[PDB]
Amino acid sequence: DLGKKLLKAARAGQDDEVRILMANGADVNATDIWDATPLHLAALIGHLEIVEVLLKNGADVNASDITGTTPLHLAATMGHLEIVEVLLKYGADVNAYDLNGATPLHLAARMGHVEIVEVLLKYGADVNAQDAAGGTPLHEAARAGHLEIVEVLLKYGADVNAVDAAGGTPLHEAARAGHLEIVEVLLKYGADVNAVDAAGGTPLHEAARAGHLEIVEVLLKYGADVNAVDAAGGTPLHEAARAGHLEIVEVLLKYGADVNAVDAAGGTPLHEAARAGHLEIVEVLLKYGADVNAVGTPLHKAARAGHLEIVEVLLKYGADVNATDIWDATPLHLAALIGHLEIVEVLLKNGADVNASDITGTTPLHLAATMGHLEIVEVLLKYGADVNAYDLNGATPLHLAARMGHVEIVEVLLKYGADVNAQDKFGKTAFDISIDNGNEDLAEILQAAALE
Amino acid sequence: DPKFESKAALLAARGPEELLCFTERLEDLVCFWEEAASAGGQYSFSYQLEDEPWKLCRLHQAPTARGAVRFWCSLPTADTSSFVPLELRVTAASGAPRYHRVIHINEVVLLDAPVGLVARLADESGHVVLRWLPPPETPMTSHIRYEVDVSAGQGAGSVQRVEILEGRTECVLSNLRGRTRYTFAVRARMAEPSFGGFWSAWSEPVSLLTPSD
Amino acid sequence: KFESKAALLAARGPEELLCFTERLEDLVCFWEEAASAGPGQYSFSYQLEDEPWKLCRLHQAPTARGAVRFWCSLPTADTSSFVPLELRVTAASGAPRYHRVIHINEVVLLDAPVGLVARLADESGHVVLRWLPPPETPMTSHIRYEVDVSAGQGAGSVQRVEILEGRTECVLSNLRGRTRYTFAVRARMAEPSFGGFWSAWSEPVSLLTPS
């Protein structure tokens, strides 16, 4: 009863009220629902007057709650230098750890309180402490990006090449976040510029992945491998064209990155840049000498997405206009399916096969009539599309246009010589599906063109 | 599954004989098509993501409507990624072409019907104030566009249909005749340009009788 | 709306639990974390004075670059000003993530003011600015303001005048003539009973002063 009245008052910070409870007979170290003593709540709010009277009148300075957090941990996380110095003078555990394994130096470096960092190190804090993740306080300082904490930790004896469970180094966290001020300092003290984590990524990989041109140039000046390969087989040039950082792509290429490097999937930077849609990067990769026709078919995915500018550049550098994929489908098929009039005009003008069929037997005119792209059907027939071609179901472009119900395209097909008398594998004609579905508008045109 | 059936019926009535794909949320994606019942694993569903290899989905056969079978497949949540062209291909047992489409997950959003529809008579001129809430457990609240339908009670009632601008969940209707029962219902869809899709089902109707001018 | 406000606070203090309230009725706490590998990962717990511990619904939303923002909106009925609110974010295993004790009245983040009107005064006054408080916001008499006098040509940051609490208009001095000035007003809850952060700038209103 009286103990719960103290922790409720210590949380509200009534200094004059608390001193009355401590003298009447309230337990100084009462257990909360989460097992937090009143000293915890006082160190969190930052009431220096309550913190001192608790320790002077006897209190648990090394108390551990249900999460493992100690009173010194709370004062180091919030950043109360006045309370931190009071706890340490009253016999606080300078190197305590919670359930995560975070020491007071870990939390102070992550939040970035340089005054609290220097006081803990001067009191006897292990600069190379490792938590459950295996990272030093320099890792937490490099991930957050505090320059002065990094300079202090390295001066006391931090491990510049510390490795955590995932294999990351302090240089990895700094290159992945984007703080060049600490990257140069880490490299000045002596960092492995080509460190490899469990995923095989180097600091140059994480830097080019985020887009920090300033860090990429600094890493390369300290001897970074421009063609490093990770577990996925991707170079820093892969990560650069994957995200589209033109400044990094141009720097890596001049330094000697391999524009034809293949990853585990089978993709060079060009297949990533053309898929992501970066006209600026695709032009630069092809100038240095990217293989425009490699395994992966970038012209297929480019014409499928609708990057008209990229499809033009790919063909202008010598891409195969009649390339084949897994389904033996040309890029003209996807362009006519997605309904891109401009790309269809570009592919056909570069020499696309207008009567090409896939494994199922569908031609670009088959796909264009099923979707209903009137503009594309017009252009395809102008280049010599087979108006009476059939697939494995025996369906002509007139068969598909009638089943989906496109009157304008049936008008164009008949103008180019569509055969209404044709039968499919079931025996039905173009006029048969018009009655099976229930469209008298389609039957009006078919019945006049069948006889004459 | 109980709500998936009601949602598939709305799309099938709009556009039969074609492959229909919809997503309640960006994470999931379901594609189905209604085909006439064959007494005779007949089809194979193939999908491909950006910078990823071709994979196959599990096909499910379910009979519905009158003498029809609805083949549907639910793509894995991990393979779904929005703002990416998804190439779909349905191939027959022999290798015949059934369907071929390239869709974007963010463009085939089918939201749920809105709830909390409340109609009130305004003291000014005799208008009606409608207030509704977005569909339950749906992200991107600020990007939902609505559409209310003012139906006339007697005879064929479809006099008024007002489009609501995205972000607001209430409107004040005007030009209603007195001594007439108007029934209201609100639609929902994801607004352009980053998101597209189809109109959702109508909310639970709310009827109100107007006084005499 | 809420997204634009949260982005300002994250830029001020990342890696830290941030709680704000647009109006006295509501309260939203969020935090942006880098790690995404491995929604039910964390549990949000809050407790009022002389009240039992309760848990809030956590929502996961991706934002920024390869980051996820876990945010929770406390119930409007549980919101109470001038009361210590103990918050604790616990991991799935039971590990400590965040622990803070804040007062709702001290983390107020108001909306931008509206109705900014600039007028040229014929008297010794220079320019007369009149604005209105943010729409539908309580405690009107306790809002403090700050106007920004920006210079038209080049880098404009000449003057920033603090307005006394309670008044929504000011008469500016020490401005050069024949210069196009752009004005915008800030808003925050004045000390000591209320604390918080500066709100976003209002819609700018430009006016040119005579010679």
Q: Give yes or no for a contact between A367 and A331, defined as CB atoms under 8 angstroms apart.
A: no
SS3 label, residue C202: coil
Q: What is the DSSP letter of C165?
A: T
Q: Which residues of B178-209 are buried (b: 16+ CB within 10 A; e: fewer)?
A: eeeebebbbbbbbbeeebebbebbbbeebeee
Residues of C in contact with A210 (CB under 8 A): 65
- Cα Dmax for chain C: 71
Q: Which residues pair with C169 in a beta bridge?
A: C130
Q: Do A305 and B94 touch (CB under 8 A)?
A: no
CA distance C178 to A40: 61
CA distance B135 to B144: 10
CB atoms within 10 A of CB C194: 23
CA distance B5 to B8: 5
Q: DSSP letters of B59-81?
A: -EEEEETTTEEEEEEE--TTT--
Of A13, A98, A111, the CB nearest to C96: A98
CB atoms within 10 A of CB C96: 23
On the 0-12 / 13-18 / 19+ scale of CB atoms within 10 A, C41 is middle
Contacts of B18 (CB under 8 A, 6+ apart): A404, B33, B99
CA distance A261 to C168: 64
Q: DSSP letters of chain B?
A: -HHHHHHHHHHHHHSTTS-EEEBSSTT--EEEEEEE------EEEEEE-TTS--EEE--EEEEETTTEEEEEEE--TTT--SSSEEEEEEEESSS-EEEEEEEEGGGSB-PPPPEEEEEEE-SSTT-EEEEEEPPSS-S-GGGEEEEEEEEESSSS---EEEEEPTT--EEEE----SS-EEEEEEEEEEPTTT--B-PPPPPPPEEEE----
- Dihedral sign from CA coordinates of A429, A432, A438, A442: positive
Q: Do C86 and A11 touch (CB under 8 A)?
A: yes
Q: What token pair was written down for C192?
A: 């000591």
Of A33, A44, A69, the CB nearest to C101: A44
CATH code at C108-211: 2.60.40.10
CA distance B51 to C202: 45
Q: What token pair was written down for B51?
A: 């910078």
CA distance A178 to A175: 5
CB atoms within 10 A of CB A203: 34
Q: Which residues of B39-68 are buried (b: 16+ CB within 10 A; e: fewer)?
A: eeeebebbbbbbbeeeeebeeeeeebeeee
The amino acid at residue B187 is: R
- The candidate with the shortest Cα–Cα distance to A271, out of A251, A243, A249, A301, is A301
Q: Do A265 and B51 touch (CB under 8 A)?
A: yes
Q: Give yes or no for a contact between B54 and B75, defined as CB atoms under 8 angstroms apart.
A: no
CA distance B60 to A259: 44
- The candidate with the shortest Cα–Cα distance to A328, out of A300, A294, A351, A298, is A300
Residues of B in contact with A275 (CB under 8 A): 50-51
- Same CATH topology for C15-107 and C108-211: the answer is yes
CA distance B149 to B113: 13
R_g of chain A computed on alpha carbons: 35
Per residue, the 3-state secondary structure of chain A, as one string, reads CHHHHHHHHHHHCCHHHHHHHHHHCCCCCCCCCCCCCHHHHHHHHCCHHHHHHHHHCCCCCCCCCCCCCCHHHHHHHHCCHHHHHHHHHCCCCCCCCCCCCCCHHHHHHHHCCHHHHHHHHHHCCCCCCCCCCCCCHHHHHHHHCCHHHHHHHHHHCCCCCCCCCCCCCHHHHHHHHCCHHHHHHHHHHCCCCCCCCCCCCCHHHHHHHHCCHHHHHHHHHCCCCCCCCCCCCCCHHHHHHHHCCHHHHHHHHHHCCCCCCCCCCCCCHHHHHHHHCCHHHHHHHHHHCCCCCCCCCHHHHHHHHCCHHHHHHHHHCCCCCCCCCCCCCCHHHHHHHHCCHHHHHHHHHCCCCCCCCCCCCCCHHHHHHHHCCHHHHHHHHHCCCCCCCCCCCCCCHHHHHHHHCCHHHHHHHHHCCCCCCCCCCCCCCHHHHHHHHCCHHHHHHHHHHHHC
Q: Which residue has the tokens 């208008």?
A: B127
SS3 label, residue C9: helix
CA distance A294 to A285: 14
Q: Do B51 and A267 touch (CB under 8 A)?
A: yes
The structural domains of chain B, with segments of one domain joined by +, span 17-108, 109-213
Q: Which residues of A363-389 are buried (b: 16+ CB within 10 A; e: fewer)?
A: bbbbbbbbbbbeebbbbbbebebbbeb
Q: Give yes or no for a contact between C101 and C85, defined as CB atoms under 8 angstroms apart.
A: yes
- Cα Dmax for chain B: 70
The superfamily (CATH) of domain C15-107 is Immunoglobulins (2.60.40.10)
CA distance A176 to A111: 18
Element holding C211 (H helix, E strand): none
Q: Do C53 and A33 touch (CB under 8 A)?
A: yes
- The candidate with the shortest Cα–Cα distance to C81, out of C108, C63, C114, is C108
Q: From A433, which residue of chain B is nearest by alpha-carbon distance?
A: B17
CA distance B7 to B111: 9
- The candidate with the shortest Cα–Cα distance to A103, out of A122, A117, A89, A83, is A117
Q: What token pair was written down for B107?
A: 């463009």
Q: Do A41 and C53 touch (CB under 8 A)?
A: no
Q: Do C101 and A41 touch (CB under 8 A)?
A: yes
CA distance A299 to A311: 6
Q: Do A67 and C34 touch (CB under 8 A)?
A: no
Strands C159-163 vs C143-151: parallel, antiparallel or unpaired: antiparallel
Element holding C42 (H helix, E strand): strand C42-47
Q: What token pair was written down for A330?
A: 């040309």
Contacts of A443 (CB under 8 A, 6+ apart): A431, A434, A435
Rounded alpha-carbon distances, angstroms, from residue C1 to A203, B150, C24, C63? 37, 31, 17, 15
Element holding C7 (H helix, E strand): helix C2-12
Q: From A276, which residue of chain B is nearest by alpha-carbon distance?
A: B50
Q: Give yes or no for a contact between A202 and A173, defined as CB atoms under 8 angstroms apart.
A: no
CA distance B63 to B6: 14
- The candidate with the shortest Cα–Cα distance to A310, out of A327, A329, A286, is A286
The amino acid at residue A120 is: L
CA distance C152 to A359: 67
Of A304, A338, A360, the CB nearest to B96: A360
What CATH class has B17-108? mainly beta
Mutation test of the interface with chain A: which of C99, C101, C106, choosing the one with the most A Cβ atoms within 10 A? C99
- The candidate with the shortest Cα–Cα distance to A208, out of A270, A268, A253, is A253
Per residue, the 3-state secondary structure of C61-118, as one string, reads EEECCCEEEEEEECCCCCCCCCCEEEEEEEECCCCEEEEEEEEHHHCECCCCCEEEEE
Q: Which residues pair with C69 in a beta bridge?
A: C32, C61
**Region for A230 from its dihedrals, namely left if φ exceeds 0, alpha if ψ lies in -120 to 50, beta otherwise:** beta
Mutation test of the interface with chain C: which of A11, A40, A47, choosing the one with the most C Cβ atoms within 10 A? A11
Chains that touch C (3 or more CB pairs under 8 A): A
Vertex A25 angle, CA A19 and A27, to 5° = 85
Q: What is the DSSP letter of C124?
A: S
* Backbone discontinuities in chain B, residue before each (C to N > 2.5 A): 40
Half-sphere exposure (Cβ direction) of C16: Cα atoms closer than 13 Å:
20
* Beta carbon pairs, A and C, within 8 Å: 48
Q: What token pair was written down for B64?
A: 């519905």
Q: Do B96 and A327 touch (CB under 8 A)?
A: no
Q: From A339, which residue of chain B is nearest by alpha-carbon distance?
A: B102
What are the phi and psi torsion angles at B183 (to 5°)? -110, 130
Q: Do A360 and B87 touch (CB under 8 A)?
A: no
* Backbone discontinuities in chain C, residue before each (C to N > 2.5 A): 38
Of A45, A69, A144, the CB nearest to C96: A69
Q: Do A359 and B102 touch (CB under 8 A)?
A: no
Residues of A in contact with B50 (CB under 8 A): 275, 301
Q: What token pair was written down for B69?
A: 């079978």
- The candidate with the shortest Cα–Cα distance to B16, out of A443, A335, A436, is A436
Q: From C37, which residue of chain A is nearest by alpha-carbon distance?
A: A166
Domain range B109-213, its CATH number among 2.60.40.10, 2.40.50.100, 3.40.50.10860, 3.40.50.720: 2.60.40.10
Chains that touch B (3 or more CB pairs under 8 A): A
CA distance A145 to A138: 10
SS3 label, residue C177: coil
Q: Which residues pair with C84 in a beta bridge?
A: C103
Q: Give yes or no for a contact between A58 and A28, defined as CB atoms under 8 angstroms apart.
A: yes
Chains that touch A (3 or more CB pairs under 8 A): B, C
Q: What token pair was written down for A23?
A: 């003298």
What are the phi and psi torsion angles at A250 (to 5°)? -70, -35
Rounded alpha-carbon distances, angstroms, from residue A327 to B46, B89, B100? 11, 10, 12
Q: Which residue has the tokens 């007979």?
A: A25
CA distance A125 to A88: 11
Q: What is the DSSP letter of C140?
A: G
The alpha carbon of residue C101 is apart from the nearest alpha carbon of chain A, in Å, by 7
Helices A374-382 and A364-371 meet at what angle, rounded to 10?
Answer: 160
CA distance A203 to A160: 14
Resolution of the structure in the document, Å: 3.2
Vertex B140 angle, CA B113 and B104, to 5° = 85
Contacts of A296 (CB under 8 A, 6+ apart): A266, A267, A268, A271
Q: What is the DSSP letter of C135?
A: S
- The candidate with the shortest Cα–Cα distance to B17, out of B102, B99, B73, B95, is B99
Of A12, A66, A110, the CB nearest to C84: A12
Rounded alpha-carbon distances, angstroms, from residue A438 to A169, A190, A442, B8? 69, 79, 9, 23
Residues of B in contact with A271 (CB under 8 A): 51
Q: Give yes or no for a contact between C163 and C144, defined as CB atoms under 8 angstroms apart.
A: yes
- The candidate with the shortest Cα–Cα distance to A270, out of A310, A213, A304, is A310
Contacts of B26 (CB under 8 A, 6+ apart): B80, B82, B105, B106, B109
Residues of B in contact with A334 (CB under 8 A): 87, 102
On the 0-12 / 13-18 / 19+ scale of CB atoms within 10 A, A126 is middle
Contacts of A150 (CB under 8 A, 6+ apart): A138, A141, A142, A158, A170, A182, A185, A186
